[PDB]
Amino acid sequence: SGGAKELKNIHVCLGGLFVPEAYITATRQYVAQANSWSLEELCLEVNVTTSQGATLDACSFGVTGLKLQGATCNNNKLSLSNAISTALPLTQLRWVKQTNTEKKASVVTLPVYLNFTRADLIFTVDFEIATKEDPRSFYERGVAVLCT
Amino acid sequence: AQSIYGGRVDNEFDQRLLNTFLERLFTTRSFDSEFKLACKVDGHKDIQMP
Amino acid sequence: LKQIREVWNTYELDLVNYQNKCRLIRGWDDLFNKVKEHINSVSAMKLSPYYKVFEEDALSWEDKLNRIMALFDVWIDVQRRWVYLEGIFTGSADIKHLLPVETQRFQSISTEFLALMKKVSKSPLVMDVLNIQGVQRSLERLADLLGKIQKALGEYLERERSSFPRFYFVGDEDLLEIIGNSKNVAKLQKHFKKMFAGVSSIILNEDNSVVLGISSREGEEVMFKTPVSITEHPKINEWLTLVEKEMRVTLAKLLAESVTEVEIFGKATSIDPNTYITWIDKYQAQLVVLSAQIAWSENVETALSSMGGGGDAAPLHSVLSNVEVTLNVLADSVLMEQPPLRRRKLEHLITELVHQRDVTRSLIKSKIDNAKSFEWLSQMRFYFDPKQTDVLQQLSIQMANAKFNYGFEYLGVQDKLVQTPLTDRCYLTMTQALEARLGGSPFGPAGTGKTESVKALGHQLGRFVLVFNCDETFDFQAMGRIFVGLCQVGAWGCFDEFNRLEERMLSAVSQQVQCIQEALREHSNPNYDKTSAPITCELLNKQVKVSPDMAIFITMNLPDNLKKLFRSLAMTKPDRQLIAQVMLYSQGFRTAEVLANKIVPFFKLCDEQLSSQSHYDFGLRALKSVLVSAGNVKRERIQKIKREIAENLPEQEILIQSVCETMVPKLVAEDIPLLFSLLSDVFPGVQYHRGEMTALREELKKVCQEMYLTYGDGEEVGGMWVEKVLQLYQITQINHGLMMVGPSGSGKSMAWRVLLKALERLEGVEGVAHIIDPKAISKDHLYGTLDPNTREWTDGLFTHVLRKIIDSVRGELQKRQWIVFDGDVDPEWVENLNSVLDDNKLLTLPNGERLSLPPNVRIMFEVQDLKYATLATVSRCGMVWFSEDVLSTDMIFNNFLARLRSIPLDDSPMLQIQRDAATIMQPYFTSNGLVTKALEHAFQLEHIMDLTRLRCLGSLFSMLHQACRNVAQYNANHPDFPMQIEQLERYIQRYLVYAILWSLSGDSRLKMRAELGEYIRRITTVPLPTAPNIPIIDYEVSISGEWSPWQAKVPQIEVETHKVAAPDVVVPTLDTVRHEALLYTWLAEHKPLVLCGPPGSGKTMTLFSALRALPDMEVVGLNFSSATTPELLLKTFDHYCEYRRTPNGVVLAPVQLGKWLVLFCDEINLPDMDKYGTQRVISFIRQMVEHGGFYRTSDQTWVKLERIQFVGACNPPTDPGRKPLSHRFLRHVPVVYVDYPGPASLTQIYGTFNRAMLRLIPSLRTYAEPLTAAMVEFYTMSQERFTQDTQPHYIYSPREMTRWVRGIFEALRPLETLPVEGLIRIWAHEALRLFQDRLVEDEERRWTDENIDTVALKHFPNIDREKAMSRPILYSNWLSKDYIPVDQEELRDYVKARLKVFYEEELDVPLVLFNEVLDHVLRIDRIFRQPQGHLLLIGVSGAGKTTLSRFVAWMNGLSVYQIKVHRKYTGEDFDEDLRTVLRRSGCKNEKIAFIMDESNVLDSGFLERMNTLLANGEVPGLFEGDEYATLMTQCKEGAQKEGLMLDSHEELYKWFTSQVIRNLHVVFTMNPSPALFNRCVLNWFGDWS
Amino acid sequence: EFIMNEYKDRKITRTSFLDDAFRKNLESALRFGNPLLVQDVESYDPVLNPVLNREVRRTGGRVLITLGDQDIDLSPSFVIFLSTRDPTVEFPPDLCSRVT
Ligand SMILES: Nc1ncnc2c1ncn2[C@@H]1O[C@H](COP(=O)(O)OP(=O)(O)OP(=O)(O)O)[C@@H](O)[C@H]1O
Ligand SMILES: Nc1ncnc2c1ncn2[C@@H]1O[C@H](COP(=O)(O)OP(=O)(O)OP(=O)(O)O)[C@@H](O)[C@H]1O
Ligand SMILES: Nc1ncnc2c1ncn2[C@@H]1O[C@H](COP(=O)(O)OP(=O)(O)O)[C@@H](O)[C@H]1O
Ligand SMILES: Nc1ncnc2c1ncn2[C@@H]1O[C@H](COP(=O)(O)OP(=O)(O)O)[C@@H](O)[C@H]1O
Structure with a gap:
């Protein structure tokens, strides 16, 4: 019905895709072809929306099904929660110019798995944590985004 | 972290967890009497150091 | 006992000749x-x-038998020992000094054995020598003496190996060569590669008496400080140990001098490049890297000692600046052209200095001052102390807490590994484990760098590291002595992949490794740190002393025996980015960081975006190869720019050019646009430009014009093909051994042939190719063999070719030789070529001779899909993918038209008529309007076999050639008024349509042909056949040039009464004559073809009659069983052909001069595929067809076929046992789908027979047509219903009606004056016994009965109201003399009485005669009365099939014979039984009942023997030589008893076949192959009601 | 073992089809007239079919069994016991119908 445009506009879930890592690669290539940026000049930026805002910026890639195992998202700011497996609706995937700046101490590298068992590292997401929270606690609590 | 226990580790994230535990335990700070082996044990309790 | 006593008087010893001119026993x-x-x-x-x-x-x-067994059992072992030890004691020199006592002992033993051999030579009788007294005792004494002396030789070898520990690396034969060829040191020089680490040759004196120095494979040479002379040290072990010690000492001295020199360079800054290069050239690469490491480590240590107080001027900054200056100097130096050895040394220096930089730059400049700090202690620190007198103690390497030393063993120049953090931690953990006396066991996905990291660590410490590869490269017999050598020299071991070993090997070597590890770790006991008694393990049942230097490494991808003895590390993810960056920087590339950062994700995408094929290799090895190629390209561009510094060449274009030039040949057609899309993504705004090669392209164009091929350039036709040829040339230049891979139907062979012609024309180097097919030839005959006794080497085909090329006879190097392997690659034979394809470039024959191919020779393979090839073979050589999209259809048409316009078919009027035809047909082939549309349409329809474009077009081209020949003949018949242009145009156009119809979709059903005809009607404007209700397929293009239906060309025949349904009597019909015309068309061009059709559809008869119809065809009938081998074809040649060498080459031609021999093949698809999916005889026949010859295994000579044509026939591939033919073979042979004859065709062909038999009685002659119509029409209804899906045996063929006619004629043969109802009742009886007994349900049988009555009524209405004669419709010839119908009760009483007598006089269990038994007895009796009555008893086991068959055979007097099948029954015994029964059936006339059970069929080959025995009536592949002669004598005698003449062997064989036809009935008893279902009458012998 | 104890008086021999001396043992037992216990009947030897079918050719005071070529005398009380050790095997109808 729409060819290329709808293939980007659709909020395809990440749990059901057969090779979602290939989907991430394809999205990266699409963003590179946009503005002819080099593939290595691109790094993933993740913002969690709600109520299906779908305010795509020609680089955002709305995805659903991601499950944050161990904490909650509060306006893209993490917070440790005892209640586990908080659903994340429409975690927009953006790619921007990597400025090679030093990431501040309020960021964490969350491994994104597909299965409930953790044996397939699709990609990594850098979230901003709450002021009181620290990376050590997140690392030891075992937080990890899960597609299924 | 690299040999011994680190040899079995395969992916980066469990290696990061191993590094976190090793640095949190294996330090000169642990010599202090009021060193927490684990913080927020059942919330109010905390494992002290003998 | 008679046979036993007569056979013992004729055995011969079968003496043969030996290399020492003696006698030996064979057989x-x-x-x-x-x-x-x-x-x-x-x-x-x-x-x-x-x-x-x-x-x-x-x-x-019996006692004679036991004496023979004892004597021969001793004799064979004595002979083997004698020949082996004679070879050892004669071939090896210096034996007079090497233990002469055993020399004299063997002299005595050999004298006695040769005396015994002279005795047995005078008496070649088996028992004449047995009766000689003292033979057995002397033989036993000789055996004992040989055993003792062999034990002495073994202990001498073990003693010598113990003397020089490195001798444990070589085998017994090689060790014998070393210890015997002391004078011929050049023999020793080849063995040095295995024993030592890097040295490959020892530089000797001019007179070869003083060991001046050593060298290596690369060319690096080390001069000994103190030469050792073999003169005063004659013993090999002595002076070899001296050479080892001198190598250690020289390495130590050179290291000390290089350290002293490098202190001057490393004092401060301002290094002079001129003197630096002199220092690098002066010292070896190993020593250079060691000196750099020592200088850097000591300088950093001194700086840290200064810094220990605090900020003491930061000399670490000065050290970093000095390192940066040296690195800049090296980076400049690599840009300038350097010698390859200096280049390798400089690259090693660059990578090591990069590591030394990075360490200080990052880890140390973070405020570290203490010299005992771990972050400094972590790095590998070198401490050189030349004060120590001992050679092995001066250099000490310490990593973390470990303190190793440096064994000074020369390593040549080995490529180093960049110190990635993964490799850093690998060194850390391996060193830590080795300090704790535990072997390291890294693991991870293959191709990540485990073995290479272990080897690099071993080379760092100077340890000699052995690598034992896993797949098919383990020799457990040598593993024990390998471990002994490692433990006795202090070398290393690194199993490439330990889990690949199967369980027994894994457990054995794991136990050995456990013992080794326990012995090693005994050296570090807390209370036994001071080792007084050396630690000794138990290997090979001896106490091998353990050296502390020794270490064992294993890599996973772990055993329980070694869990507590081995440490493990995971290197799953290597660091490709840093490796690429450092490699690019070491190659002179500027901004290498960005290039690496771009290239690594590009290869990661290539593992992701592109497809998945085995030949693809995006691993770490390929990346490094691409990087070194890019460095070569950059240096070449710099050199080219110089001849018209210059640090402005864009690097990205160079990198992508190297990537493309290396990788594009391996890409498939689909991947190339994907590759360029990935290049545009990762490397945006960067373009790749092809190498012009304009000098070669002109010669390529000339060759294409002279080879009738089409040349192209870029986007035009042939551009892809010529580009593929250019890439093939590139791969030829880069390496040797390339394989060209692509789907069958591309220009693979043409590419290399044309490129060879272009190279010969351009460079002037003559090119002679050697196309060898290895699948057809035996591998043992492909390479050679050693006979067990003489051990004489008879070189194979490939071995002979390689020896001829290497031998200084003709064209050793002035001519380029291209050994092209045509066929399919698989481990069996490429195992030998593995050692030739790699960098070793050597061929180790089983005899032991090593053959190295000269540089000009290129070993190419041409295969089709590359799916059964080992990854080792694929990786060892480059390849180019010939996609099917390369060979364009329009270019096929252009080549065809050029060849037609150029080559005369009858090799000027022929050329003129060909050119006229080509001009007429031009607007169809080249234009994409008719032939291409038809081709795609035919591809999208269904065919009996897979559709290949080349076959489908070659058949079309062949028929066009035949049309041109037809026009030539038409002109020949009418000289005046020749073929005019308008008649030519009409004829050629309509014949073109006809040839499209029979080439395209010519192997499909009638409906598919009709669909093709309708599509053609839609897509053409030429004159179509007028009638639109008749298929276009039905018509024929007359020589006049108009559509004439084929039916008008169908004649009528009147076969004689005594030849009705005869073995070989074809009656002309539409399909028969049409296929006859087609077979003539293809047979004219000597084009092999195979008729494919359902069983018994009239294939063998049609093709056999067509062949014997031609006056110049001699037909030899071959049967292709499952076990059919090329040896059958070879025997056929040796019987019916003769070898002559009078032409330029040996030529094979039929013995009958001027006769075109044809080798008809029964069931060409029957031969079974081997375990690599290739049929040996199919590849052999493809070799005969394509290249027109093969290689004689006797003398390895190419013999070309003369006057030999191959034609075959086969069932559809979907049938059981029908393996589809290879696509390569399929393109050579077009196939014709011979479907079951249509209704009207059956009516005609069998009305002929009906009239023929009814002519016997004139009254019944008037009923022939209704009888034929009723028969064929009833068979029709029986053919729509009762298909094979309901029951596997419900198959119907036009053979059933042949049996019908033959049966009716047999019934009427002695009878006379039959009324119409008599003929109808006989017809009904035959219909019941052929179409109703086969049924399994009573409803089916009643339906058949009703249809029989219905068709009898509708076809002839003048029969009495009686159905046939009555309901039972019974026939018996016991009650009366003739085959008169009988009643029920009298027949029952007669059968009951005779059955009582039967079980009274032969059997022991009473038989009851109920209705079913009576009916089955009647059926089997009818079967036996008819010659070639073969019965298929299908029914439950133990229901009386065999007993009833025996009973009826006894009643009719048929002698009963059956096979005594046991567990170890073989094919030869079964063939012998078949010979016996045939002999009793052909000669000595005897009606034989051949009752085979389902369990009696032990092998499928027995079923094939039955298939060829039943339909044909004889087994052509059963009579051979002496058997044939004896059977011929018996046949000729039996001929004259019965009243015939001897005449010739051929007519006597015909008569023998007739005698078997009349006197052999085979009955098959089966429990509930379609071909076996036909040609046998099926009897549903159901379970008891 | 029950059969072994029962027919130990008759010197019943224990063998299997896998044994290469199976044919020789069968010939010896059949000639002497001793019972035979052939286990491992999964790989049934078709040479036993003449014995199982009881094809007794009592001709000229010579009862014979057609074992291969050399027909040997059928001694009385030639009891060949067949046995196996697995309970899951689908025997061919030829062997199944000839035994209890
Ligand atoms: N321009 C052309 N270049 C090469 N071959 C051409 C050209 N035009 C037509 N052809 C035909 O295409 C075919 C190329 O097949 P080729 O003989 O090179 O392959 P092969 O190795 O013998 O077998 P296959 O490719 O089926 O495995 C030949 O029949 C050749 O006559
Ligand atoms: N048109 C025909 N004219 C004469 N006889 C025919 C015709 N069609 C079929 N037959 C008969 O049918 C039978 C077919 O012969 P044959 O057994 O060689 O069949 P086939 O198709 O070659 O078999 P298979 O596939 O088993 O090798 C013969 O008995 C032949 O006489
Ligand atoms: N750290 C490294 N630096 C440079 N090259 C490497 C490194 N690790 C592996 N390689 C390259 O990879 C290739 C194959 O590695 P290999 O040792 O066969 O891995 P594996 O043990 O998994 O089979 C080697 O040619 C080697 O040069
Ligand atoms: N109609 C019958 N009446 C009596 N006994 C029969 C009959 N049919 C078969 N038998 C018995 O079956 C035994 C063997 O049958 P067999 O011929 O082996 O059957 P099959 O040929 O189906 O294997 C014979 O001993 C015979 O006594």
Whole structure:
């Protein structure tokens, strides 16, 4: 019905895709072809929306099904929660110019798995944590985004 | 972290967890009497150091 | 015992000649197995109570048998020992000094054995020598002496290996060569590669008496400080140990001098490049890297000692600046052209200095001052102290807490590994484990760098590291001595992949490794740190001393025996980015960081975006190869720019050019646009430009014009093909051994042939190719063999070719030789070529001779899909993918038209007529309007076999050639008024349409042909056939040039009454004559073809009659069983052909001069595929067809076929046992789908027979047409219903009606004056016994009965109201003399009485005669009365099939014969039984009943023997030589008893076949192959009601 | 073992089809007239079919069994016991119908 445009506009879930890592690669290539940026000049930026805002910026890639195992998202700011497996609706995937700046101490590298068992590292997401929270606690609590 | 226990580790994230535990335990700070082996044990309790 | 006593008087020793001009015994199989059979026979007969025939003779024969066994058992072992030890004691020199006592002992033993051999030579009788006294005792004494002396030789070898520990690396034969060829040191020089680490040759004096120095494979040379002379040290072990010690000492001295020199360079800054290069050239690469490491480590240590107080001027900054200056100097130096050895040294220096930089730059400049700090202690620190007198103690390497030393063993120049953090931690953990006396066991996905990291660590410490590869490269017999050598020299071991070993090997080597590890770790006991008694393990049942330097490494991808002894590290993810960056920087590339950062994700995408094929390799090895190629390209561009510094060449274009030039040949057609899309993504705004090669392109164009091929350039036709040829040339230049891979139907062979012609024309180097097909030839005959006794080497085909090229006879290097391997690659034979394809470039024959191919020779393979090839073979050589999209259809048409316009078919009027035809047909082929549309349409329809474009077009081209020949003949018949242009145009156009119809979709059903015809009607404007209700397929293009239906060309024949349904009588019909025309068309061009059709559809008869119709065709009938081998074809040649060498080459032609021999092949698809999916005889026949010849295994000579054509026939591939033919073979042979004859065709072909038989009685002649119509029409209804899906045996063929006609004629043969109802009742009886007994349901049988009555009424209405004669419709010839119909009760009483007599006089269990038994007895009796009555008893086991068959055979007097099948029944015994029954059936006339059970069929080959025995009536592949001669004598005698003449062998064989036809009925008893279902009458012998 | 104890008086022999001396043992037992216990009947030897079918050719005071070529006398009380050790095997109808 729409060819290329709808293939980007659709909020395809990440749990059901057969090779979602290939989907991430394809999205990266699409963003590179946009503005002819080099593939290595691109790094993933993740913002969690709600109520299906779908305010795509020609680089955002709305995805659903991601499950944050161990904490909650509060306006893209993490917070440790005892209640586990908080659903994340429409975690927009953006790619921007990597400025090679030093990431501040309020960021964490969350491994994104597909299965409930953790044996397939699709990609990594850098979230901003709450002021009181620290990376050590997140690392030891075992937080990890899960597609299924 | 690299040999011994680190040899079995395969992916980066469990290696990061191993590094976190090793640095949190294996330090000169642990010599202090009021060193927490684990913080927020059942919330109010905390494992002290003998 | 009669056979046993007569066979023992004729055995011969079968003496042969030996290399020492002596006599030997051959044929152990014949002289053991038959003797054992005689022992079994005598033991059984004496055991059996029927021994009252011979009593004392049996015991005498038995003791003679045991004497023969004892004598021969001792003799064979004595002979093997004698020949082996004679070779050892004669071939090896210096034996007079090497233990002369055993030399004289073997002299005595050999003298006695040769005396015994002279005795047996005078008496070549088996028992004449047995009766000689003292033979057995002397033989036993000789065996004992040989055993003792062999033990002495073994202990001498072990002693010598213990003397020089490195001798444990070589085998016994190689060690014997080393210890014997002391004078010929050049023999020793080849063995040095295995024993030592890097040295490959020892530089000797001019007179070869003083060991001046050593060298290596690369060219690096080390001059000894103190030469050792073999003169005063004659013993090999002595002076070899001296050479080892001198190598250590020289390495130490050179290291000390290089350290002293490098202190001057490293004092401060301002290094002079001129003197730096001199220092690098002066010292070896190993020593250079060591000196750099030592200088850097000591400088950093001194700086840290200064910094220990605090900020003491930061000399670490000065050290970093000095390192940066040296790195800049090296980066500049690599840009300038350097010698390859200096280049390698400089690259090693660059990578090591990069590591030394990075360490200080990052880890150390973070405020570290203490010299005992771990972050400094972590790095590998070198400490050189030349004060120590001992050679092995001066250099000390310490990593973390470990303190190793440096064994000074020369490593040549080995490529180093960039110190990635993964490799850093690998060194850390391996060193830590080795300090704790535990071997390291890294693991991870293959191709990540485990073995290479271990080897690099071993080379760092100077340890000699052995790598034992896993797949098919383990030799457990040598593993023990390998471990002994490692433990006795202090070398290393690194198993490439330990889990690949199977369980037994894994457990054995794991136990050995556990013992080794326990012995090693005994050296570090807390209370036994001071080792007084050296630690000794147990290997090979001896206490091998353990050296502390020794270490064992294993890599996973872990055993329980080694869990507590081995440490493990995971290197799953290597660091490709840093490796790429450092490699690019070491190659002179500027901004290498960005290039690496771009290239690594590009390869990661290439593992992701592109497809998945085995030949693809995006691993770490390929990346490094691409990087070194890019460095070469950059240096070449710099050099080219110089001849018209210059640090402005864009690097990205160079990198992508290297990537493309290396990788594009391996890409498939689909991947190339994907590759360029990935390049545009990762490397945006960067373009790749092809190498022009304009000098080669002109010669390529000229060759294409002279080879009738189409040349192109870029986007035009042939551009892809010529680009593929250019890439093939590139791969030829880069390496040797390339394989060209692509789907069958591309220009693979043409590419290399054209490129060879272009190279010969351009460079002037003559090119002679050697196309060898290895699948057809035996691998043992492909390479050669050693006979067990003489051990004489007879070189194979490939071995002979390689020896001829290497031998200084003709064209050794002035001519380029291209050994092209045509066929399919698989491990069996490429195992030998593995050693030739790699960098070793050597061929180790089983005899032991090593053959290295000269540089000009290129070993190319041409295969089709590359799916059964080992990854080792694929990786060892480059390849180019010939996609099917390369060979364009329009270019096929252009080549065809050019060849037609150029080559005369009858090799000027022929050329003129060809050119006229080509001009006429031009607007169809080249234009994409008719032929391409038809081609795609035919591809999208269904065909009996897979559709290949090349076959489908070659058939079309062949028929066009035949059309041109037809026009030429038309002009020949009418000289005046020749073929005019308008008649030519019409004829050629309509014949073109006809040839499209029979080439395209010519192997499909009638409906598919009609669909093709309708599409053609839609897509053409030429004159179509007028009638639109008749298929276009039906018509024929007349020589006049108009559509004439084929039916008008169908004649009528009147076969004689005594030849009705005869073995070979074809009656012309539409399909028959049409296919006859097609077979003539293809046979004119000598084009092999195979008729594919359902069983019994009129294929063998049609093709056989077509062949014998031609006056110049001699037909030899071959049967292709499952076990059919090329040896069958070779035997056919040796029988019906003769070899002549009078032409330029040997030529094979039929013995009958001027006769075109044809080797008809029964079931060409029947031969089974081997376990690599290739049929040996199919590849052999493809070799004969394509290249027109093969290689004689006798003398390895190419012999070309003359006057030999191959034609075959086969069932559809979907049938069981029908393996589809290879696509390569399929393109050569077009196929014609011979479907079951249509209704009207059956009516005509069988009305002929009906009239023929009814002519016997004139009254019934008027009913022939209604009878034929009723028969064929009833068969019609029986054919729509009762298909094979309901029951596997419900198959119907036009053979059933042949049996019908033959049966009716047999019934009427003695009868006369039959009324119409009589003929109808006989017809009904035959219909019941052929179409109703086969059924399994009563409803089916009643339906058949109703249809029989209905068709009888509708076809002829003048029969009485009686159905046939009555309901039972019974026939018996016992009640009366003729085959008169009988009643029910009288027949029942007669059968009951005779059955009572039967079970009274032959059987022991009473038989009851109920209705089913009576009916089945009647059916089997009818079957036996008819010659070639073959019966298929299908029914439950133990229901009386065999008993009833025996009963009816006894009643009719047929002698009963059956096969005594046992567990170890073989094909030869079954063929012998077939010969016996045929002999009793052909000669000595005897009606034989051949009752085979389903369990009696032990092998499928027996079923094939039955298939060829039943339909044909004889087994062509059964009579051979002496059997043939004896059977010929018996046949000729039996001919004159019965009243015939001897005449010739051919007519006597015909008569023997007729006698088997009349006197052999085979009955098959089966429990509930479609071909076997036909040609046998099926009887549903259901379970008891 | 029950059969072994029962027919130990008759010297019943234990053997299997896998044994290469199976044919020789069968010939010896059949000639002497001793019972035979052939286990491992999964790989049934078709040479036993003449014995199982009881094809007794009592001709000229010589009862014989057509074992291969050399027919041997059928001694009375030739009881060949067949046995196996697995309970899951689908025997061919030829062997199944000839045994209890
Ligand atoms: N321009 C052309 N270049 C090469 N071959 C051409 C050209 N035009 C037509 N052809 C035909 O295409 C075919 C190329 O097949 P080729 O003989 O090179 O392959 P092969 O190795 O013998 O077998 P296959 O490719 O089926 O495995 C030949 O029949 C050749 O006559
Ligand atoms: N048109 C025909 N004219 C004469 N006889 C025919 C015709 N069609 C079929 N037959 C008969 O049918 C039978 C077919 O012969 P044959 O057994 O060689 O069949 P086939 O198709 O070659 O078999 P298979 O596939 O088993 O090798 C013969 O008995 C032949 O006489
Ligand atoms: N750290 C590294 N630096 C440079 N090259 C490497 C490194 N690790 C592996 N390689 C390259 O990879 C290739 C194959 O590695 P290999 O040792 O066969 O891995 P594996 O043990 O998994 O089979 C080697 O040619 C080697 O040069
Ligand atoms: N109609 C019958 N009446 C009596 N006995 C029969 C009959 N049919 C078969 N038998 C018995 O079956 C035994 C063997 O049958 P067999 O011929 O082996 O059957 P099949 O040929 O189906 O294997 C014979 O001993 C015979 O006594």
